[PDB]
Amino acid sequence: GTSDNSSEINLVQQSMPNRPNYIGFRDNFVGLMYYNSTGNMGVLAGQASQLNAVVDLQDRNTELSYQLLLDSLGDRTRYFSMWNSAVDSYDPDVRIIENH
Amino acid sequence: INFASLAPRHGTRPFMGTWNEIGTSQLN
Amino acid sequence: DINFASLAPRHGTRPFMGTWNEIGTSQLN
Amino acid sequence: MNGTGGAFEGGLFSPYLTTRLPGWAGVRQNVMGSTVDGRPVLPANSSTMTYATVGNSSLDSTAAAAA
Amino acid sequence: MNGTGGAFEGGLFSPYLTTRLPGWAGVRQNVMGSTVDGRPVLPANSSTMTYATVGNSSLDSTAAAAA
Amino acid sequence: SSIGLRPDGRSSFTPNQAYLTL
Amino acid sequence: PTHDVTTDRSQRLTLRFVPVDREATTYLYKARFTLAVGDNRVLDMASTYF
Amino acid sequence: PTHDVTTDRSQRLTLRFVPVDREATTYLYKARFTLAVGDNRVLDMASTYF
Amino acid sequence: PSMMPQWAYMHIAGQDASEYLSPGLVQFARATDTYFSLGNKFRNPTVA
Amino acid sequence: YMNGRVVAPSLVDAYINIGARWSLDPMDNVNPFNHPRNAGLRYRSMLLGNGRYVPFHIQVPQKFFAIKNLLLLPGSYTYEWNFRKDVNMILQSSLGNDLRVDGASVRFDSVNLYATFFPMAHNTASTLEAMLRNDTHDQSFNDYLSAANMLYPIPAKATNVPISIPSRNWAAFRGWSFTRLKTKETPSLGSGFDPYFVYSGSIPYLDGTFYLNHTFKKVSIMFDSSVSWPGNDRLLTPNEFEIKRSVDGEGYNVAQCNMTKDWFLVQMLSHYNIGYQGFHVPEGYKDRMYSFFRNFQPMSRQVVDEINYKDYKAVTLPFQHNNSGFTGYLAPTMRQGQPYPANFPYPLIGQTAVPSVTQKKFLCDRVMWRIPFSSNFMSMGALTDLGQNMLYANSAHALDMTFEVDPMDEPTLLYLLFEVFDVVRVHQPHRGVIEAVYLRTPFSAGNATT
Amino acid sequence: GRYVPFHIQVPQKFFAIKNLLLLPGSYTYEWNFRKDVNMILQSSLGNDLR
Amino acid sequence: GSIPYLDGTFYLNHTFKKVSIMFDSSVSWPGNDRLLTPNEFEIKRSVDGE
Amino acid sequence: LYPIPAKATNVPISIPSRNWAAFRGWSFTRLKTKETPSLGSGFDPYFVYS
Amino acid sequence: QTAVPSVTQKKFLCDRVMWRIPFSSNFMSMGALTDLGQNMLYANSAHALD
Amino acid sequence: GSIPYLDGTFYLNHTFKKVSIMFDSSVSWPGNDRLLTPNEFEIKRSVDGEGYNVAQCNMTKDWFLVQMLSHYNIGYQGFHVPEGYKDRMYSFFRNFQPMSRQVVDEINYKDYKAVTLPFQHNNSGFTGYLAPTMRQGQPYPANFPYPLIGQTAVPSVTQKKFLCDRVMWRIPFSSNFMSMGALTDLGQNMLYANSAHALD
Amino acid sequence: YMNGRVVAPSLVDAYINIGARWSLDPMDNVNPFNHPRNAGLRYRSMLLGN
Amino acid sequence: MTFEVDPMDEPTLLYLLFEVFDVVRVHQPHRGVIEAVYLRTPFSAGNATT
């Protein structure tokens, strides 16, 4: 029907469970600090002389550069909790359904 | 020898050797 | 006097010529 | 379905599609924006819209503290 | 009608139109293509199409060779 | 380091040839 | 002039000092900034405004 | 090695630094610290983290 | 012109780290390398 | 919304391509890193907890290339950094929904920076400073990627996307590298906060999980109307780079898929230099997670051809009836029906197999295609072979590139980056003073000629 | 209207600071801002706003 | 009417937003870092957070 | 060859900066896409014209 | 006294002026021949702005 | 069963809190001020810690530094996952597992009723009763697992923890906790090798 | 005794610590190497025979 | 350049065609050997890169 008045035909109802969603911080905490935006950019300077040494360009993204660097050193299969390193790894079978 | 005195002694002589001044790696 | 070191990649100011690892030793052994 | 190579070469003849995406928010012609952070105030009404009348500085949510 | 200068400039003004037509088959947009040479079933639907599953290695209609 | 002998197939834009004695 | 009128290094033009501490009493509001003038640059106080 | 590898005086190994000034916008957080690498010690920037 | 002055200064071509560093540092960095390595801060060119 | 949109189970049920390992074509371009089985995420979410409210405590590192490995001599420095509270950005859902509408990381309470000092004897720590402060030797770091990246747009259903570069000096240029990004999932990085980023899922731009990488067809590298950059008749089709060659008569596909021959040769040569001396599976250490060979996946299937079977009857989904009487009609619900012989999956085996046509494609992801700017495509060093040749020539050429991408019904982005050198030369001459001088050779970004 | 957000910039009007041209260094800078509605903003009718 | 092109009566000047300069192919002219958003000249901050 | 859309005029073009050491002039006409093969490839199955 | 909760809108409206972006380091007009109109980065070489 | 004493199957080293070392009641050995905590070693700072935790668990920022410093020397040039050859199956990083859950807090929740196991009923009517026996019951709505998601999101408090098996806590007798040699530098000084010192 | 004693199934059911990586604190300090899924032991047990 | 054309109703395409000086010099130094050196001067088919 179209009612929730506990009618007779309301006995026959089915309910699928809601779809799973899991939400937590990104790998290596990418996106939590503004890197590479010239507007809100960081400053590491020689406090006595405010000469910033972190001149950052608008294009070269250091988030993508760091992920590649992490893979080059060692391998990204052991989950390091402290830095929150956990590579997003789709299940190999689900992408390519080998139906046997 | 003052700088060479900061290295572990594997026996009698220090452990200096195999100059590994690196840092060239990039994408390539 | 034409050495072949000019064909070798340079790691710094010296060529990257290797050692005497020129071998083809293996068999099932 | 036509007007730009509707029967021959197209997709993009026109251009040196060389505008690099300009990097500044707001380059999305009719994408209902989301919202002000946190708030889900739906409106972020679309940037091809009513932006001459500059940001409506709405009264901030401080019901408990301000009262 | 509308689009690029529905009322004004440019049948094309947007561009630099300097895409020099790049020369490779399939540059055309929605042309019902020809057949594989002497294989008329109107095979080439378009180069905007089921070419997502590219690689239709199609066995021809040679039945006497099959016998 | 065998030999760089340079007397003066061939090409028209250079009157130069090189001998390599190994 | 082309030589010593102005610099070439990445020098910010306008700064946005934020209050180190603040208070909001019943009758007044007090904010405290620590404006820092780096070496080899000089600030004209006329170009300052809350 | 024993002679001149590590000090015998008093030194911390880990230091925490509270923000000198902080700015909490609706979608930002701008924290400014002051690293203080005292005399006769060097800090490798890879160890620092927020 | 395989070497431009701006390239040699920024270590895109020219001497590698084992050479342009002062002899005091190279001897130092070789010594204290089981602990507190210094070999990932001075880059050295690899031209082709 | 994306819950309560029931999908007919018969769409992809137990008989789809009953023999082959075929990627389901409708979800070929769907982002695969958004899944309950994404083991990288489900570990990264259960780390915080299993409840709605989480008083977290994290240790975000520093990852800027000139600061990540600096060795700070004993001064006294400021260290300021703007963080980000945009829930759509810092968080990451699994459906890729819009988290700004639901709940946000309300508060950053007490961020404070930690530092660890090696306790070094004051005799050596003073000697080390005394020479590290000398201008003869000073730290120098190069960004690992070292590439000036730009995003060119691609509208809906567009196929040919051309780009251009005005006349410019290609002093030390190490090649190109490109991929495709769906524009509905990419932040406007230049803005402090963009309210038009309705997304939470994986962001391949700044994360590295590229999946749309397999939809390119052809590439041409024109240097101011000269022949293509490899144009010394150096390929099977020396005028341009075929990638995903379609139905083709001559023998140019490779590796049982539709990837062409030279492109496989170029890709294999670039990563591993294993092109000329025969093809072999490379060293386990030499291929990384983001390498070409580890992710390459050919696949193929055969389907009932329609133009030759003489009895083909295209039955739409609502009407096909396999396994009827023991499952739901078009929703995962109570089973309804009668039993009866099925009709949907046309048999491809046995004495009654229908004639069929094979279609073969490949599924490469998590990598970005590479075209090294080297004479023989090898990697014989950092400063490539032709980089030094431009310097000796000392002339400027404009670049013109065009692409042929598979059409998509949603706007996307062509993310192409030029390999460059991105070195810095940080030097600290006195106490509490840092002087960092940046150079980025082939695409400079400086207003000062020293 | 009645309820109205404002974003104003107030100058400096003290003769020793109005134009000081202060050399490099680091200075603390605080000031107390009036919050009395009656004094801050004037009314045409001359009535009492508090 | 009154043509603004040859007669200097311009009236639609207030409809502009961010304008960007990028000189060679990457270098942005407005300066090394010379504005509060040192990548383009912003003329109308449509919605301002600070 | 430069494309020209349907029902469109004012076709612009350009050549990026280069040298004209022995240039001798231009020569141009106006073909039809229906009547021009893409002979940069071995065989174009989208050319239906005798 | 019976007002309604509201929201403000700002905007500016200028006519007759052409926006200007001087090609100087500090944007000041210290002369006709500008400051960057004679230095060799923008005099010796050739660039192509976008 | 397995005897952890003599075959290396330790599993209880996750229940230590603080280790204090004193040489004849002098100043503590760990050093002058080498540790964030003033005069002891702190582990499992679980009850509450204002700013000292690591890896989203209840360890200590200094104990993690010491442990990684004794095994892989990864303490001063930043932390990173150690190399495979240097990380065995009895080492710290291989067996370190942090975890945390979100039990429903009772102090701040409006209406919380702690129901014991014999009275709580979930999935009733389709399962056994307190024993893996034949299913008995009627179906009815359930009541035990308090929800933590959705519109009804009863407030909760988070408790974290960590497990560390097959590993022995290590406190190297060195000035900087490194492994510069088998014969430590501190256990070589005249102060320790030419006199007798107590230990508490 | 350790076999004739029954355990309530609901003590740890399918709904315990849902979505959490918890270690079931009641069974945390019990010996973990005593289990049918102890691949080392069940290999040695089956090595002798059955 | 900028060609203005009549608005035909079907997708035509312009066919600009520059003028160059492409020549060859075929050389046969000895039996069975032939080599050539092409040169298109204005729009050179080869440069430093290729």
Coordinates of N, CA and C in Angstrom, one line a residue, chain B residues 1-8 15-26 28, chain I residues 17-18 21 24 26-32 34-35 39-46:
Chain B
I1 N 91.4 12.2 12.0 CA 91.0 11.0 12.8 C 89.9 11.3 13.8
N2 N 89.8 12.6 14.1 CA 88.7 13.1 15.0 C 87.3 12.7 14.5
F3 N 87.1 12.9 13.2 CA 85.9 12.5 12.6 C 85.7 11.0 12.5
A4 N 86.8 10.3 12.2 CA 86.8 8.9 12.1 C 86.7 8.2 13.4
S5 N 86.8 8.9 14.5 CA 86.6 8.3 15.9 C 85.2 8.2 16.3
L6 N 84.2 8.6 15.5 CA 82.8 8.6 15.8 C 82.1 7.3 15.2
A7 N 82.9 6.4 14.6 CA 82.3 5.2 14.0 C 82.5 4.0 14.8
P8 N 81.5 3.0 14.8 CA 81.7 1.8 15.5 C 82.9 1.0 15.1
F15 N 84.2 1.4 11.2 CA 83.3 0.8 10.2 C 83.1 1.8 9.0
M16 N 84.0 2.8 8.8 CA 83.8 3.7 7.7 C 84.0 3.0 6.4
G17 N 83.3 3.5 5.4 CA 83.4 2.9 4.0 C 82.1 3.0 3.3
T18 N 82.2 2.7 2.0 CA 81.1 2.7 1.1 C 80.3 4.0 1.1
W19 N 81.0 5.0 0.5 CA 80.4 6.3 0.4 C 79.1 6.3 -0.3
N20 N 78.0 6.6 0.4 CA 76.6 6.5 -0.1 C 75.9 7.8 -0.1
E21 N 76.6 8.8 -0.6 CA 76.0 10.1 -0.8 C 75.1 10.1 -2.0
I22 N 73.8 9.9 -1.7 CA 72.8 9.7 -2.8 C 71.6 10.7 -2.6
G23 N 70.6 10.5 -3.4 CA 69.4 11.5 -3.3 C 69.1 11.9 -4.7
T24 N 69.4 11.1 -5.7 CA 69.1 11.5 -7.1 C 67.8 10.9 -7.6
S25 N 67.2 10.0 -6.9 CA 66.0 9.2 -7.3 C 64.9 10.2 -7.6
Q26 N 64.2 10.0 -8.7 CA 62.9 10.7 -9.0 C 62.1 9.7 -9.8
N28 N 61.3 9.1 -13.3 CA 61.9 8.5 -14.4 C 61.0 7.4 -15.1
Chain I
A17 N 77.9 14.3 -5.1 CA 78.0 14.7 -3.7 C 79.4 14.3 -3.1
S18 N 79.9 13.2 -3.5 CA 81.2 12.7 -3.0 C 82.3 13.6 -3.3
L21 N 81.2 18.3 -1.9 CA 81.3 18.5 -0.5 C 82.7 18.7 0.0
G24 N 86.0 17.6 4.9 CA 85.6 17.4 6.3 C 84.3 16.7 6.4
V26 N 82.6 14.8 4.0 CA 82.6 13.5 3.4 C 83.2 12.5 4.4
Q27 N 84.3 12.8 5.0 CA 84.9 12.0 6.1 C 83.9 11.8 7.3
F28 N 83.3 12.9 7.6 CA 82.3 12.9 8.7 C 81.1 12.0 8.4
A29 N 80.5 12.2 7.2 CA 79.3 11.5 6.9 C 79.6 10.0 6.7
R30 N 80.8 9.6 6.2 CA 81.1 8.2 6.2 C 81.2 7.6 7.6
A31 N 81.7 8.4 8.5 CA 81.9 7.9 9.9 C 80.6 7.6 10.6
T32 N 79.8 8.7 10.7 CA 78.5 8.6 11.4 C 77.4 8.2 10.4
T34 N 76.2 4.4 10.5 CA 75.3 3.4 11.2 C 74.2 4.1 11.9
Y35 N 74.4 5.3 12.4 CA 73.4 6.1 13.0 C 73.4 7.5 12.4
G39 N 73.1 11.0 4.0 CA 73.2 10.8 2.6 C 72.0 10.9 1.8
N40 N 70.9 11.5 2.4 CA 69.7 11.7 1.6 C 69.4 13.2 1.5
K41 N 70.3 14.1 1.8 CA 70.1 15.5 1.8 C 71.0 16.2 0.7
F42 N 72.1 15.6 0.3 CA 72.9 16.1 -0.8 C 72.7 15.3 -2.0
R43 N 72.0 15.9 -3.0 CA 71.7 15.1 -4.3 C 72.9 15.2 -5.2
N44 N 73.0 14.2 -6.0 CA 74.1 14.1 -7.0 C 73.6 13.8 -8.4
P45 N 74.1 14.5 -9.4 CA 73.5 14.4 -10.7 C 73.8 13.0 -11.3
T46 N 72.9 12.6 -12.2 CA 73.1 11.4 -13.1 C 72.7 11.8 -14.5

